[PDB]
Amino acid sequence: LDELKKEVSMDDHKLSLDELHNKYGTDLTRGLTNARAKEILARDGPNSLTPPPTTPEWIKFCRQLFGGFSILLWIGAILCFLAYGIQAATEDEPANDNLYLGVVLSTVVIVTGCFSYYQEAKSSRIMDSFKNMVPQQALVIRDGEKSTINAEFVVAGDLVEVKGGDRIPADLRIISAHGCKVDNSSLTGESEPQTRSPEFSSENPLETRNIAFFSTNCVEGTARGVVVYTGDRTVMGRIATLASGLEVGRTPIAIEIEHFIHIITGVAVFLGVSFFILSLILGYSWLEAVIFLIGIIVANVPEGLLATVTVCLTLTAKRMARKNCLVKNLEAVETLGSTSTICSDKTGTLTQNRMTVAHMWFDNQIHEADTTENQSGAAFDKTSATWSALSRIAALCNRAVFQAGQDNVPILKRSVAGDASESALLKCIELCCGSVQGMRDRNPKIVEIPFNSTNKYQLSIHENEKSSESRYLLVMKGAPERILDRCSTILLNGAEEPLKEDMKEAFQNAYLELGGLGERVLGFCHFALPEDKYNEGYPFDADEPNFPTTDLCFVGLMAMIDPPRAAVPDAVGKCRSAGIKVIMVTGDHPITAKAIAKGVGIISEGNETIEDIAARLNIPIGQVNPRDAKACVVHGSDLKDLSTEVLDDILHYHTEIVFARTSPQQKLIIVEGCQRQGAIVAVTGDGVNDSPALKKADIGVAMGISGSDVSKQAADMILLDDNFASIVTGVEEGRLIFDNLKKSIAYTLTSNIPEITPFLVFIIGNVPLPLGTVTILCIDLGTDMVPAISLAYEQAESDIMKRQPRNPKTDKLVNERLISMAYGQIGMIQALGGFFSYFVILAENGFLPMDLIGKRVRWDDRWISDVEDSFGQQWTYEQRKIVEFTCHTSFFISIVVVQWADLIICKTRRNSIFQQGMKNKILIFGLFEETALAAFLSYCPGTDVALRMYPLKPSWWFCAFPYSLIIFLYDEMRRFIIRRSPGGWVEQETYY
Amino acid sequence: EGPDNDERFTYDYYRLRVVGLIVAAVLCVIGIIILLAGK
Amino acid sequence: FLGRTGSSWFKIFLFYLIFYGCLAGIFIGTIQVLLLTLSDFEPKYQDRVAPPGLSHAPYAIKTEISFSISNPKSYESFVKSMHKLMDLYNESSQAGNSPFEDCSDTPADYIKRGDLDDSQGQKKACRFSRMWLKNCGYAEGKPCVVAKLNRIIGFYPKPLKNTTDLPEELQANYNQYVLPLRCAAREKIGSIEYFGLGGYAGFPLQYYPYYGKRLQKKYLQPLLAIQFTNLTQNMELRIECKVYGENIDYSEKDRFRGRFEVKIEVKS
Ligand SMILES: *[C@@H]1O[C@H](CO)[C@@H](O[C@@H]2O[C@H](CO)[C@@H](O)[C@H](O)[C@H]2NC(C)=O)[C@H](O)[C@H]1NC(C)=O
Ligand SMILES: CC(C)CCC[C@@H](C)[C@H]1CC[C@H]2[C@@H]3CC=C4C[C@@H](O)CC[C@]4(C)[C@H]3CC[C@]12C
Ligand SMILES: *[C@@H]1O[C@H](CO)[C@@H](O)[C@H](O)[C@H]1NC(C)=O
Ligand SMILES: [K+]
Ligand SMILES: [Mg+2]
Ligand SMILES: [Tl+]
Ligand SMILES: [Tl+]
């Protein structure tokens, strides 16, 4: 469906103005007829974007109500009402058991539904942001007259007019223009104004001057044009549809959840029906056969687990909110940890998005300035008298000014009225020479010649601030070579000197080096005009050369670039040390893209492209073995004629990849290419041209300050302070939460065994029921909750940023090793500790373990109010039941006591508690509150009716203590083996 | 005692409940103290 | 295979065999020590049987015994359980001076055979003739229910003293030696008739205290036969038999705590 939109567009900028009118039945001068425009409206439809059909929240909520655990809990809830129905008909049961348990279980499903619904959130308003880029109104020429109309009423063929400050209402063929410049950052991510004129200037319509696009704005001048595309058919309207239309897809974390749901659901249905038939064979009435099944359901399903996961995710997202990293989708909290490839935009993401002075060439020396936002570098020069001469030209031969009321904000961050290069120079001098306004007050400008297309230079004449002179100084800047052809002397370390071929060659060298760094280079020179030849009232003519512009003194060079953000180089290296592959994907030109790649460490030192090898060896590129080149730089124009299989080979064959001059669909294609190889991919960006890629990414991260509204709609995560170091933190947090989820899951599952085994022995042994159904829910929904959550606050056991990204095909959240430990080893020890306390309670009340076998028949018989114990005493029905429920209560408390040790062992997968310590305060809180809850549930009056919880005698609490301790020792010995031999036996069997 | 051994079939479940609830409360307070050591 | 290789499948079996073996051996060990802390003659706790339960022979479907006099197999169900109990009180079962003893044919005081020790043989229990149960196949019309006080080791059932007012106000009040049992329904549409030891409507105190199964096997607890020769027919009659005493109490939950709940209906 969207495969059409993933392709490069076709256009009609090649046609003549006249020819273009024939195609759209239009007038170049009079414009369309009121009737013809209305006709075309009904024909083509409105100049608007329609949002894609969404899934209502209704269906979204209910889709969770049927996912493995909820299905089993539904079967339980209904099976409760089943047994209740069968009762209400047969023998009038005045009880509330099956009825209430059926109500409780149905509530558990609904509430669990809210948790998973909260986790599976999708806040997407892509198409809405795009719609915000179409103006409310447009100016059209109809019947030879200009009028404002609803922009939706704009059709292909009419004559539109735009001017500085307004949004392009539709894709236009420029037919007339006067000084028109446009901001195409929507399509390129670059905000430098692009001229628009009627002349065709490139085969590529996205590069030609005679096309203006919807989603962009006119920055200055005026233009008229013929509408060629409207609504969904515009270049960026299609990007809108592509972006808004892209299928979301399941996250890595989501896939893991479903996976263990299958496992646990599997064992549940297995043991469920495996013992349902095992009971009927033993001659159990279907009346009972279902009651046992309900218990089996409740025992096997970890009722509180899915909600635990959600809370652990939420708490991890809260910590990241506190580092200026907003998470829109709870699952995106983990994806960053599983990320193996980052596709990053350059401008406004890796870079500050601001022309900044990078180097200066004066005194036959290359000086480097500090490009960082917060200025974390050092000085270059202050002493040289040459510097002050260059500094003066940079301030004086400059027409840029700071906007009013910025004195509060830092120099480099403040808004400037002017072109990017003049702003850069302004901020450079203001920083290291103080107020520039002061320099422009001490040296009043009397005449100037602003930068001309033809002159290729800008000159200014000022009253020298010096009192002993107060004469006229000439300054000029422009193209380095043009400035050179106008110089005779060079200000070396203070004093001038003739411009010999020697210094002239050093100039060329300096010029070539700076240009090689992808930096824009300017020349600077001045000339102190002779006093006798220029009186204090001498008039200077700016129109006609009234003053010399030759034999001037060359002062120096200055170079500039849109520099990396301070934290970016280090963040890139850190991603790469964690084994994450970092690719650059930018709409910017290749020379600039490549230079920043080396600056931030995308391309490491020494690595070459095929073009680099060819130039170094002075040989044809076809003569170069492409396998000798680990780095590559792909232009979008070449990308366009490559198949995906060939794109896949590029991705496979290079470690250091730069995709430059890419369109928005091309970014999507590169992302998909990476994913196709089985990689989890993150995208980082800030422009509307990142929207499709951000949507398709497993996780999209947008910049918060510099980011466009669209990009932040398309993302899963926002960096609110533009701190790229947050990606590094995000991946670290993502890995940590993945491990801690394992700990929390194992902990929760472990207590399933002591809830399952009592029901089994109840059938096979014919003893009184050791633990009840209600009692199970008091564990999974009550006591285990805070402890399970607390594992989310566990510190790393080792340097997680030192390991490679997990293999999502092999490294699962819940594997066989977890089940073996939780179900086969620790849970089994917990089961016994439960049974022990059960036998203790009964034996101390007169029913010794031996006489318990095959007694349930008489025990449950409501009409036998005289059962004989081991000592020959006789018990009524309600009397023995009180002891039985007291058994449920102590078995319950036994679970809590054995979960103490389990909580401590689940703390660490490898390390010892004596190494990791007990610095998790939430965990300790869990221990205290868990025990408080259990005690309250046993001793609070009335709980014997609502939950069948009975007061325990002090000695009862200590039954499971020896089992709780064996768990601690056992797991500590086991992990001691793991560490002592990384070999594999204990490791490959039990290492979560 | 002999025929007056009524205490043999008696248990102070009332005190046990009072003590049990005291303990539960104090464990609840202790927990808050440790948690609130930083919020 | 599914998971691993044969070598791995073996090792995982050798482990869980030794592992579960140890766990079973430990579990058994903790059961040993538990038993080691317990007496053979007396349970550690008795507060959960404390107030004695009162149970009868007619096995009630739901605290009810409804049947038809004009039908044979209508009551043959209740006669099965009635027979089961009384079959134990046979004279052929009580033979010789061992381990039985002839006790007062009239309600007497308690009998202490020492302590709950094995320092003596089987503590000798009082004989009880089912022949003390006058009038009661059993009552084919108007049932002859048999009551019973639940056995509790070392329990001395103490009758109420005639200090103040009483339900069966002072009638045949053998204050010193009889634990009374008065059945009731207002709703007085019946005819209560009690049979027992010495002809009294109670339990003779000479059968106490019970020394337990280990120290007193073949022991016989006193019975109290109750006959309802009601002149009514074809209606549910809620009859409650209540025992009175210092050590006797009741509960709204446990409807068998020192009392009966019988729903007789001679629907004939
Ligand atoms: C306990 O006493 C009952 C009294 O009914 C015995 O029942 C006797 O059963 C036999 C054989 O079935 C009959 O011939 C008699 O008529 C019954 N009564 C009597 C008085 O002998 C019953 O057998 C006795 N049980 C034991 C174990 O001795
Ligand atoms: C109540 C009692 C009788 C039930 C005992 C169940 C035992 C036999 C179960 C419980 C947990 C189970 C193990 C759980 C995990 C694994 C790892 C997997 O890669 C192979 C199977 C294996 C090794 C299972 C084998 C059987 C097992 C040990
Ligand atoms: C009980 O049986 C006796 C004979 O043993 C008889 O005289 C008497 O009438 C019976 N009593 C009743 C109330 O039927
Ligand atoms: K995404
Ligand atoms: Mg950008
Ligand atoms: Tl469970
Ligand atoms: Tl659990």
Choose one of C130, C132, C133, C135 to mutate for the ligand 3 pocket test, by most ligand atoms within 8 angstroms of C-beta.
C135
Indicate whether A699 and A660 sit together in one domain.
yes
Selecting from C23, C43, C59 the residue whose C-beta is nearest the C-beta of A845 gives C43
PDB experimental method:
X-ray
CA distance A296 to chain C (A): 23
Bridge-based pairing state of the strands C192-195 and C223-228: antiparallel
- Find out whether the beta carbon of C135 lies less than 6 Å from any atom of ligand 3: yes
Indicate whether A86 and A162 sit together in one domain.
no
Q: Which amino acid is at A694?
A: L
Indicate whether A939 and A973 sit together in one domain.
yes
Choose one of A816, A825, A835, A989 to mutate for the ligand 2 pocket test, by most ligand atoms within 8 angstroms of C-beta.
A816
Q: What count of other Cβ atoms lies within 10 Å of the Cβ of residue A533?
A: 10
Selecting from B17, B28, B32 the residue whose C-beta is nearest the C-beta of A939 gives B17
Q: Which amino acid is at C256?
A: F
- With b meaning 16 or more CB within 10 Å and e meaning fewer, what string describes A472-505? bbbbbbbebeebbebbebbbbeeeeeebeeeeee
State the Cα–Cα distance between residues A312 and A300, nearest whole angstrom. Answer: 22
Structure tokens at A121: 């959130």
Comparing C-alpha atoms, which of A132, A247, A122, A239 is closest to residue A189? A239
Q: Is the dihedral of CA A519, A520, A523, A524 positive or negative?
A: negative
Q: Is the dihedral of CA A831, A832, A836, A837 positive or negative?
A: negative
State the Cα–Cα distance between residues A92 and C62, nearest whole angstrom. Answer: 10
Residue the block writes with tokens 């979008």: A636
A929 close to B (CB below 8 A): yes
Residue B27 falls within a domain, yes or no? yes
Question: Which of the listed residues A547, A563, A579 is the one where a domain comes to its end?
Answer: A563
Query: DSSP string spanning A814-862?
Result: S-HHHHIIIIIIIHHHHHHHHHHHHHHHHHHTT--HHHHTT-HHHHS-T
Cβ neighbours for A970, distance < 8 A, ≥ 6 positions apart: A825, A826, A829
Residue B4 falls within a domain, yes or no? no
Torsion angle in degrees (nearest 10) through CA of C194, C200, C203, C205: 180
Comparing C-alpha atoms, which of C229, C259, C266 is closest to residue C136? C229
Q: Where are the beta strands (DSSP E) in A789-908?
A: 867-868, 874-875
Q: What count of other Cβ atoms lies within 10 Å of the Cβ of residue A256?
A: 23
Alpha helices in A205-358 (DSSP H): 235-245, 252-281, 286-300, 305-321, 332-335
What's the gap between Cα A952 and its chain centre?
52
CB pairs under 8 A between B and C: 21
Bridge-based pairing state of the strands A211-212 and A171-183: antiparallel
State the Cα–Cα distance between residues A233 and A48, nearest whole angstrom. Answer: 10
On whether the CB atoms of residues A741 and A312 are closer than 8 A, the answer is yes
A721 is catalytic: no
A460: three-class secondary structure by DSSP: strand
Alpha helices in A397-479 (DSSP H): 420-433, 436-442
Indicate whether A253 and A204 sit together in one domain.
no
Residue B1 falls within a domain, yes or no? no
What CATH number did the domain enclosing A691 receive?
Answer: 3.40.50.1000
Residue A121 falls within a domain, yes or no? no
Q: What count of other Cβ atoms lies within 10 Å of the Cβ of residue A164?
A: 16
Q: Where are the beta strands (DSSP E) in A501-614?
A: 520-528, 552-561, 581-585
B33 close to A (CB below 8 A): no
Residue A207 falls within a domain, yes or no? yes
Q: Which helix (H) or strand (E) holds A344?
A: strand A341-344
State the Cα–Cα distance between residues A960 and A890, nearest whole angstrom. Answer: 9
Structure tokens at A268: 């549940």
Structural domain containing residue A420? 353-563
Indicate whether A195 and A215 sit together in one domain.
yes
Alpha helices in A90-167 (DSSP H): 97-119, 126-131
Q: Chain A 954-983, CB below 8 Å of chain C: which residues?
A: 962, 966
Selecting from B3, B10, B11 the residue whose C-beta is nearest the C-beta of C156 gives B3
Comparing C-alpha atoms, which of A409, A336, A314, A375 is closest to residue A724? A336
On whether the CB atoms of residues A629 and A635 are closer than 8 A, the answer is no
On whether the CB atoms of residues C112 and C209 are closer than 8 A, the answer is yes
Comparing C-alpha atoms, which of A348, A360, A355 is closest to residue A400? A355
Task: Sort A276 into a burial class: Cβ within 10 Å, 0-12 / 13-18 / 19+.
Answer: middle
Q: What are phi and psi of C86, to 5 degrees?
A: -70, -25
Which residues on adjacent β-strands are paired with residue C226?
C194
Indicate whether A719 and A732 sit together in one domain.
no
Question: Which of the listed residues A679, A704, A724 is the one where a domain comes to its end?
Answer: A724
Q: What count of other Cβ atoms lies within 10 Å of the Cβ of residue A202?
A: 12
On whether the CB atoms of residues A946 and A940 are closer than 8 A, the answer is no
How far, in Å, from the CA of A356 to the mean position of ligand 5? 16
CA distance A794 to chain B (A): 15
Torsion angle in degrees (nearest 10) through CA of A654, A659, A664, A669: -20
State the Cα–Cα distance between residues A336 and A731, nearest whole angstrom. Answer: 5
Which residues on adjacent β-strands are paired with residue A463?
A472
| CB-side neighbour CA atoms (13 Å) of A802 | 4
Q: Chain B 4-33, CB below 8 Å of chain C: which residues?
A: 5-6, 8-11
Count of structural domains, chain B: 1
Indicate whether A875 and A921 sit together in one domain.
yes
Residue A891 falls within a domain, yes or no? yes
CB contacts of B21 in chain A (<8 Å) are 935-936, 939-940
Indicate whether A677 and A607 sit together in one domain.
yes
Torsion angle in degrees (nearest 10) through CA of A352, A354, A355, A359: -30
Indicate whether A681 and A808 sit together in one domain.
no
C72 DSSP 8-state letter = G
State the Cα–Cα distance between residues A427 and A404, nearest whole angstrom. Answer: 15
Q: Of all atoms in ligand 2, which is nearest to the CA of residue A760?
A: 1
- Find out whether the beta carbon of C92 lies less than 6 Å from any atom of ligand 1: yes
State the Cα–Cα distance between residues C85 and A64, nearest whole angstrom. Answer: 60
Residue B22 falls within a domain, yes or no? yes
Q: Left (φ > 0), alpha (ψ -120 to 50) or beta: where does A818 sit?
A: alpha
Comparing C-alpha atoms, which of A255, A291, A251, A260 is closest to residue A121? A251
CB contacts of C176 in chain B (<8 Å) are none
Indicate whether A348 and A399 sit together in one domain.
no
Structural domain containing residue B19? 11-35
Structure tokens at A630: 């680990």
On whether the CB atoms of residues A650 and A630 are closer than 8 A, the answer is no
A44: three-class secondary structure by DSSP: helix
Which residues on adjacent β-strands are paired with residue C224?
C147
If DSSP states are collapsed to H, E and C, what string results for A733-746? HHHHHHHHHHHHHH
What CATH number did the domain enclosing A195 receive?
Answer: 2.70.150.10
Residue the block writes with tokens 């007050």: A441
Q: Is the dihedral of CA A305, A307, A312, A316 positive or negative?
A: positive
Residue B18 falls within a domain, yes or no? yes
Structure tokens at A346: 């350059």
Q: What angle do CA A550, A555, A559 make, to 5 degrees?
A: 115
State the Cα–Cα distance between residues C37 and A74, nearest whole angstrom. Answer: 46
- With b meaning 16 or more CB within 10 Å and e meaning fewer, what string describes C179-198? bbbbbeeeeeebebbbbbbe
Q: Of all atoms in ligand 3, which is nearest to the CA of residue C135?
A: 1
State the Cα–Cα distance between residues A602 and A252, nearest whole angstrom. Answer: 26
Length of chain A: 992
On whether the CB atoms of residues A317 and A324 are closer than 8 A, the answer is no
Residue C65 to residues A782, C236, C266, Cα–Cα distance (Å): 45, 10, 9
Torsion angle in degrees (nearest 10) through CA of A917, A922, A923, A928: 120
Edge to edge, what strands does the sheet with A341-344 contain? Answer: A325-327, A717-719, A699-703, A681-685, A341-344, A581-585, A656-660, A631-635
CB contacts of A921 in chain B (<8 Å) are 34-35, 37-38
Choose, out of B8, B11, B14, B16, the residue to mutate when testing the contact with C (most C CBs < 10 Å). Answer: B8
State the Cα–Cα distance between residues A787 and A751, nearest whole angstrom. Answer: 12
CA distance C238 to chain A (A): 17
Bridge-based pairing state of the strands C223-228 and C146-148: antiparallel
Residue A583 falls within a domain, yes or no? yes
Q: What are phi and psi of B4, to 5 degrees?
A: -105, 50
Cis preceding linkage at A56, omega within 30: no
What's the gap between Cα A651 and its chain centre?
22
Q: What count of other Cβ atoms lies within 10 Å of the Cβ of residue A970?
A: 16
Indicate whether A165 and A30 sit together in one domain.
yes
H and E: helices and strands count for chain A = 39, 27
Task: Sort A986 into a burial class: Cβ within 10 Å, 0-12 / 13-18 / 19+.
Answer: middle
Residue B2 falls within a domain, yes or no? no
A372: three-class secondary structure by DSSP: coil
Q: Of all atoms in ligand 3, which is nearest to the CA of residue C227?
A: 13
Alpha helices in A397-500 (DSSP H): 420-433, 436-442, 480-484
User: Scanning every residue of chain A, which has its alpha carbon at the shortest distance from the alpha carbon of C218?
Assistant: A872
Q: What are phi and psi of A944, to 5 degrees?
A: -70, -15
Which residues on adjacent β-strands are paired with residue A584?
A344, A658
Q: Which amino acid is at A727?
A: I
Question: Which of the listed residues A563, A583, A598 is the one where a domain comes to its end?
Answer: A563
Structure tokens at A922: 């939430």
CA distance C44 to chain A (A): 5
Q: What are phi and psi of A905, to 5 degrees?
A: -80, -35
C67: three-class secondary structure by DSSP: strand
Residue A821 falls within a domain, yes or no? yes
What CATH number did the domain enclosing A425 receive?
Answer: 3.40.1110.10
Structure tokens at C258: 């020192």
Residue B6 falls within a domain, yes or no? no
What CATH number did the domain enclosing A97 receive?
Answer: 1.20.1110.10
Choose one of C87, C88, C136, C138 to mutate for the ligand 1 pocket test, by most ligand atoms within 8 angstroms of C-beta.
C87
Q: What angle do CA A934, A940, A946 make, to 5 degrees?
A: 90
Comparing C-alpha atoms, which of A732, A722, A703 is closest to residue A802? A732
Q: Which amino acid is at B14?
A: Y
Count of structural domains, chain A: 4
How far, in Å, from the CA of A70 to the mean position of ligand 7? 15
Structural domains present in chain C: 1-38 (1.20.5.170), 39-268 (2.60.40.1660)
Q: Is the dihedral of CA A529, A532, A537, A541 positive or negative?
A: negative
Indicate whether A456 and A577 sit together in one domain.
no
CB pairs under 8 A between A and B: 51
Q: What are phi and psi of C72, to 5 degrees?
A: -65, -60
A925 close to B (CB below 8 A): yes
Residue A52 falls within a domain, yes or no? no
A747: three-class secondary structure by DSSP: helix
Edge to edge, what strands does the sheet with C192-195 contain? Answer: C146-148, C223-228, C192-195
Q: What count of other Cβ atoms lies within 10 Å of the Cβ of residue A308?
A: 25
Which residues on adjacent β-strands are paired with residue A551?
none
Q: Which among A345, A562, A722, A971 is annotated as catalytic? A: A345
Q: Which helix (H) or strand (E) holds A851?
A: helix A849-852
Q: Where are the beta strands (DSSP E) in chain C?
A: 64-67, 100-101, 125-126, 146-148, 178-184, 192-195, 202-204, 223-228, 237-243, 262-266
Q: Left (φ > 0), alpha (ψ -120 to 50) or beta: where does A984 sit?
A: left
On whether the CB atoms of residues A226 and A25 are closer than 8 A, the answer is no
| CB-side neighbour CA atoms (13 Å) of A616 | 10
If DSSP states are collapsed to H, E and C, what string results for A671-683? HHHHHHCCCCEEE
As annotated, the binding site of A includes 209, 303, 345-347, 419, 422, 451, 456, 477, 520, 586-587, 686, 690, 716, 751, 755, 780
Selecting from C47, C112, C247 the residue whose C-beta is nearest the C-beta of B11 gives C47
Cis preceding linkage at C209, omega within 30: yes
State the Cα–Cα distance between residues A865 and C254, nearest whole angstrom. Answer: 10
User: Scanning every residue of chain B, which has its alpha carbon at the shortest distance from the alpha carbon of C248?
Assistant: B6
Alpha helices in A176-251 (DSSP H): 185-188, 235-245
